[PDB]
Amino acid sequence: RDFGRKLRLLSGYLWPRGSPALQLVVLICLGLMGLERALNVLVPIFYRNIVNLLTEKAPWNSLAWTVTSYVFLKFLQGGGTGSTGFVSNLRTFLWIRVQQFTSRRVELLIFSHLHELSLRWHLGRRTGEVLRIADRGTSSVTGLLSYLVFNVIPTLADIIIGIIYFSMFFNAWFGLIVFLCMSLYLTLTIVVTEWRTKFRRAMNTQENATRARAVDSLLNFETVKYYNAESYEVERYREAIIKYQGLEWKSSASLVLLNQTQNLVIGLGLLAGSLLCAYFVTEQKLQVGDYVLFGTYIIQLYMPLNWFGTYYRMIQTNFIDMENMFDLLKEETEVKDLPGAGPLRFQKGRIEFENVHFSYADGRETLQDVSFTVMPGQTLALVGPSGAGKSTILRLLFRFYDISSGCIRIDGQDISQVTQASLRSHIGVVPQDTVLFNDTIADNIRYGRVTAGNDEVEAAAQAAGIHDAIMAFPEGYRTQVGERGLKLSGGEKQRVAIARTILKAPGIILLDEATSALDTSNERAIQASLAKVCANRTTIVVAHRLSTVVNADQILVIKDGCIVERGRHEALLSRGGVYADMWQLQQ
Amino acid sequence: RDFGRKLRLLSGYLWPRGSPALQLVVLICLGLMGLERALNVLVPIFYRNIVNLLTEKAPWNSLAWTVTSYVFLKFLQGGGTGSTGFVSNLRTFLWIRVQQFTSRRVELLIFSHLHELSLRWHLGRRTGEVLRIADRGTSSVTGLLSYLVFNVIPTLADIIIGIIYFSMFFNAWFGLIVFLCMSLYLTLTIVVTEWRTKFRRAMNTQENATRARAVDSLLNFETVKYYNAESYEVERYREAIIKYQGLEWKSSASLVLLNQTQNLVIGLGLLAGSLLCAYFVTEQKLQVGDYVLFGTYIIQLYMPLNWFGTYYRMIQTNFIDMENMFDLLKEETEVKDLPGAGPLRFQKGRIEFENVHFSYADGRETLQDVSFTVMPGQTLALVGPSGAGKSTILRLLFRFYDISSGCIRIDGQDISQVTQASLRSHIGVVPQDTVLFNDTIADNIRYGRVTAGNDEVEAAAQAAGIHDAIMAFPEGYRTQVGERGLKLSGGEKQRVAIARTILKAPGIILLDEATSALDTSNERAIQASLAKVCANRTTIVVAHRLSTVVNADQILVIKDGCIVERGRHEALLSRGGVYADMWQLQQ
Numbered sequence A, B: 001r002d003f004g005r006k007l008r009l010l011s012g013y014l015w016p017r018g019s020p021a022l023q024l025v026v027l028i029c030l031g032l033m034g035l036e037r038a039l040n041v042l043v044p045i046f047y048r049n050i051v052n053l054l055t056e057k058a059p060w061n062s063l064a065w066t067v068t069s070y071v072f073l074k075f076l077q078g079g080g081t082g083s084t085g086f087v088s089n090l091r092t093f094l095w096i097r098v099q100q101f102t103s104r105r106v107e108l109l110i111f112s113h114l115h116e117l118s119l120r121w122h123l124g125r126r127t128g129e130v131l132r133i134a135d136r137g138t139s140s141v142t143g144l145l146s147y148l149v150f151n152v153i154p155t156l157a158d159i160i161i162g163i164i165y166f167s168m169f170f171n172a173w174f175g176l177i178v179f180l181c182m183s184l185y186l187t188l189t190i191v192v193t194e195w196r197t198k199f200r201r202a203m204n205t206q207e208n209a210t211r212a213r214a215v216d217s218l219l220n221f222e223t224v225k226y227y228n229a230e231s232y233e234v235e236r237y238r239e240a241i242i243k244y245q246g247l248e249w250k251s252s253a254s255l256v257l258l259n260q261t262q263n264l265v266i267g268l269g270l271l272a273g274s275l276l277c278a279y280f281v282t283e284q285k286l287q288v289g290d291y292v293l294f295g296t297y298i299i300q301l302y303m304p305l306n307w308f309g310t311y312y313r314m315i316q317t318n319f320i321d322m323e324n325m326f327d328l329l330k331e332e333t334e335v336k337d338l339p340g341a342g343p344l345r346f347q348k349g350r351i352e353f354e355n356v357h358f359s360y361a362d363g364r365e366t367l368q369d370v371s372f373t374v375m376p377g378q379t380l381a382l383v384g385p386s387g388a389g390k391s392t393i394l395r396l397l398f399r400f401y402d403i404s405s406g407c408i409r410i411d412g413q414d415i416s417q418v419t420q421a422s423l424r425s426h427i428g429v430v431p432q433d434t435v436l437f438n439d440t441i442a443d444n445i446r447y448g449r450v451t452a453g454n455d456e457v458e459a460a461a462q463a464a465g466i467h468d469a470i471m472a473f474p475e476g477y478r479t480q481v482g483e484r485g486l487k488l489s490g491g492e493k494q495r496v497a498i499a500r501t502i503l504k505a506p507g508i509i510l511l512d513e514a515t516s517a518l519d520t521s522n523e524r525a526i527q528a529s530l531a532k533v534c535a536n537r538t539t540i541v542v543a544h545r546l547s548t549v550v551n552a553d554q555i556l557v558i559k560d561g562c563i564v565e566r567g568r569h570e571a572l573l574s575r576g577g578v579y580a581d582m583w584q585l586q587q
């Protein structure tokens, strides 16, 4: 039933293909499992020997030695519920290390491969669902291995070994009795389990619904604002509670029924076995100790079978979760890749366009036959209505999609024939809302270059005029910054964005202006700093204000993928066309 | 150790003081617990009888009947791990019903009392934390009762009963042996359960930190935007994983030690008992069956005492959660309430203000000596800068806070000592951002009156001009609406707000103008509807546009708690004051 490939993948993930100091640990763990399985069978034999020696008035010495050996063996073996003895504890003590190793490896792998994807897929689904999928996937990879290997194979092996022992060394009917009892136990526990899976899921769905209902009567506090509607909400909560309680009652009972069907089957068992053994004993066919041996063996072999239910249920789920996570990882639809080879030669920073058409969505087209060429060092600007074309062309400048038709070349070299690393390193981008994550300002600034020391940080503090503002803070570089720490203003995060821009030392500045209201002096200082970092550097600015455009060397207007102005600035001044639009935009 | 009052409260919650059909259930459950405890002691006596009868070659009939009785008894008693037998399953089968009843009652109580609170407390902390506190509180109330009553008292009772039995009917030294073994087991379990507690909490904190770290590398997709910072994020994740794995390893190692300290104190005890019993057997002081009897009793005590060991931590945690939930319920910070008695009768709706002072924050004061009086049917309006005073006075019209100093009267009756029910019933309020929860629009409309039938819904749909939209939707009143369903426009939700306003049919309309830009024809239709619902009804409107002011009878301007305009509409037009502000607002 397609289990072959599944088990092959599980085996692949089991063996630590890496460090050679862990295969020895795995071998030791398997040997310990084998020793535990042997002890589990050979303890009752010593119990029977003790009883037999006691019933024939043996001398004290042999009795003492045998009882000491039996007690030591019981201590080594699981002295109850399987998972108590010394052997199982050592097995856990090594498997924790091996499990941590494998979980770390798989988690790093999935994290890196998920981070390697493109943007469209990352906007396709929300982050919470995918993070939950990943966490459940790694938890399943560990737990399914643990559950199967160390709780479902040992139990079946114990069952088979006990059947063989009873059929060979004890009699010919006890084997049949045990086999029938265990077969009935297994099949009944399996079915009952499916019926219960049904009535249960329905309980989890109802619980999720009744929990979601509760939130929207505490997060939507308009009840009193509208009317005296406390009674209505109370009644609705009562009805939801009633439904959930009914489903819960049905579930819990299924469990009581699985539990008792089991406690019966094992019992019809004991009876049959105990009655037959007693009858065989009373006619000198067996010994006294055989009775206690059979009782102890049946009890001890039934002991780890009490959870087969939970185990079926889970070994299933975790398989579904593994399917989901492997489907996530196996996806190869990440079409933003690179050619076979070819670095980038950033000679001077030439940018050219040749009738490029692109539409980020489907159905209709937004950008078509856009063509313009910018001399290096000139601060070209883009203006237009409230549209998404500006952001689109911003992204195609940054190799964030794949152009459907056209060509984008830089310095006489196509950007589609080079790796993303150099092209993205040479360009610094300032977004509208520069949001930062939870860390100190020191690593925030060093985020520009990992190998750059604090010398570049001091240089940036001197250059960007942030030294006085930074040292004004009494907490120093170890200040708690972010949503966890203190809040900052928009101007401050723009300033730190310029700081990391100077850290980058880029070749092109594809900056986007923020729309924050501020005094003209601070904005002019910011623009002066931007000019002094983009001096003798290509610059593209997107804004709705003419202050940055009046001194700009070239201005373009985009109207649904159309450009109607070109040439030098004096030509546009002499046009006298939408210059009315510029006049009415100036005020 | 302060346990007395806590146990008294637990006893209070245990007995269902309500319906008379559950006292019988509780009595039956306690009787079943007692019967289980008796069986758990009296089974090994039958085992010893069987062995003794087998060793003296008893006749077959007595042996068969005794063995059948013993097997039946084992089936009735827990045939392993305590929670398997028929008796325990029946106890669960009734406790599920009683637990559902008590949980439902406590949850409804806490929900209603929490919903009765005021607003400032609800802005003191977010809803998620308080809801999680409530849910943990109810879960603890159920689980702590279950854990204690049915798994910590029975085990200690079993220990004491076994000690008594061994000291009385068996010998004078087995009691000492068992007592010493059990005392050592308990004390070692307690101490190792504490040291491990520490190391562990540290594991939970580290896990929470690492998990929270992952979300801020997927909700902050700026890595590609800034620079090739995949390596830095991968390294940071690796370091966090390393720290978490170290803490996890320490915790697992601690667990492996508690387990074995136990499996020893049990091994030492069993060794001593078995050796002494065998030596006493070899000198004809005891019987053969006493050996198997002693062996079979220790195993029982051990199962339960194992999981006992664990249950310490949980009783402790929960008692913390119960303390938190009871502290939440005992909170009395609801200062917006009503005097000892006094209903309200609304005649016509006179409103007067006599130099009232109010400050919702602390330190400074915002609203002071505010005085105005509104004739019925006059749409009095407030205007000013970007300030919250307008919303504040909107709130004080609704008895949403307590006036610091002054006098507020409606219809010549002070509102500070009247019931909130009628006072909020006679007044309808239209907010700016009307948020609704997950349900159909039919209930959204019916929200006006719980007792109102569909006849009023049809009449209001005809009156408010919303029937055409209803017929437009092919799903009718049964359309799936809300954030889970399809979205609606701002104009539509304002319209449904007016619809529920007509459902209320109030006497005073403390409406607030919507801040949505829309076609002037729809706005004039909305204004006509508002006039036709506010005809011969008092109205107060807050807006920054002159559309609601041109026809207004009286307009007030707030200047950080100052009012300088008063009089009739012609009077304020002729005053020649902030009329300049009116002209400069128009264009």
Ligand SMILES: N[C@@H](CCC(=O)N[C@@H](CS)C(=O)NCC(=O)O)C(=O)O
Residues within 6 Å of the ligand: A255, A258, A259, A262, A306, A307, A308, A309, A310, A311
């Ligand atoms: N009756 C189950 C016992 C399994 C069990 O009780 N384990 C706990 C989990 S720690 C459980 O299942 N209780 C909650 C549930 O019903 O799922 C079986 O025989 O497999």
Ligand SMILES: N[C@@H](CCC(=O)N[C@@H](CS)C(=O)NCC(=O)O)C(=O)O
Residues within 6 Å of the ligand: B255, B258, B259, B306, B307, B309, B310
């Ligand atoms: N040897 C453990 C057995 C109990 C146990 O391990 N139970 C599970 C809970 S189902 C557990 O504790 N695992 C998580 C943990 O280590 O706390 C003890 O004596 O406490």
